[PDB]
Amino acid sequence: PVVWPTLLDLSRDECKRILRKLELEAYAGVISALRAQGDLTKEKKDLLGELSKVLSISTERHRAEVRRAVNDERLTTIAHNMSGPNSSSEWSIEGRR
Amino acid sequence: GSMPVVWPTLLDLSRDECKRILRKLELEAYAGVISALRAQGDLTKEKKDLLGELSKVLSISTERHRAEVRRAVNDERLTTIAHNMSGPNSSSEWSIEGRRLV
């Protein structure tokens, strides 16, 4: 006997889409704040690793958010002002793997 | 002489404003993690302890943490997502976390 996608099924799929957008936005927000603080450290790398697991962020999406933040001129300016010119080695290594 | 007679304001720092944007970023970062975790379902010890590591790194006080929890547990949209994702018991542990410690 057949079955098919109901409105509830499509509703649950849409909730998953909304959740995934919230999760990626959350993770990107943490990367942005950490990048603006200065360079990446091992402790922050570890913390990001746990956050990516709990927010279901793939390594591909992680690396792309690291690069986005390293390259964002506003965040780079904040790091320059707050921490000084050394601010992105280590983030850039992480964004390469 | 060595120094410019027409100083290009390009060179100037904006330390006060950057300090404020950094703080805005930190608070927005923590709030967004609370909101996403709340939309997943109820709080777990693993989420609580991870939020504790995040609050250290983002300089978030325990008062601000609990206020974010109370906000998120009561957000109608985040709660609708959690009920659809995780079922009807998606709030009690969050509400405990929002209330205790004073």
- Which CATH number is A42's domain given? 1.10.1240.40
- The span from the CA of A81 to the CA of A74, in Å, is 11
B37, two tokens: 């975790």
- The 8-class DSSP code of residue B92 comes to H
Q: How many domains does chain A have?
A: 1
In one letter, which amino acid is B86? S
- In this complex, do A82 and B47 lie within 8 Å of one another by their Cβ atoms? no
State the Cα–Cα distance between residues B6 and A39, nearest whole angstrom: 34
What does this entry list as its resolution, in Å? 1.1
Contacts with A14 (C-beta within 8 Å, 6 or more apart), sequence order: none
**How many angstroms separate the CA atoms of A66 and A69, rounded?**
5
Q: Which residues of B touch A52 (CB under 8 A)?
A: none
A6: distance to nearest CA of chain B, Å?
14
B44 Cα to chain A: minimum distance (Å)? 11
Of A15, A43, A77, the CB nearest to B18: A77
Chain A nearest-CA residue for B30:
A30
Amino acid at site B14: S
Contacts of A55 in chain B (CB under 8 A): 33, 36-37
Beta carbons of A50 and B47 less than 8 Å apart? no
Instruction: List the structure tokens of A67.
Output: 């690069």
Cβ neighbours of B35 in A, within 8 Å: 22, 26
Longest dimension (CA), chain A: 67
Say yes or no for a CB contact (<8 Å) between A78 and B18.
yes
The CA distances from residue A1 to A8, A9, A10, A28, B74, in Å, are 19, 18, 21, 45, 42
Domain that holds residue A92: 1-97
**A72: closest CA of chain B, how far (Å):** 14
Residue A76, burial from CB neighbour count under 10 angstroms (0-12, 13-18, 19+): middle
Whether residues B81 and A19 touch (CB distance < 8 A) is answered with yes
Length in residues, chain A: 97
SS (H, E, C) B15-75: HHHHHHHHHHHHHHHHHHHHHHHHHHCCCCHHHHHHHHHHHHHCCCCHHHHHHHHHHHHCC
Helix (H, G, I), strand (E, B) or coil at A97: coil
**Residue B37 and residue A19: Cβ atoms within 8 Å?**
no
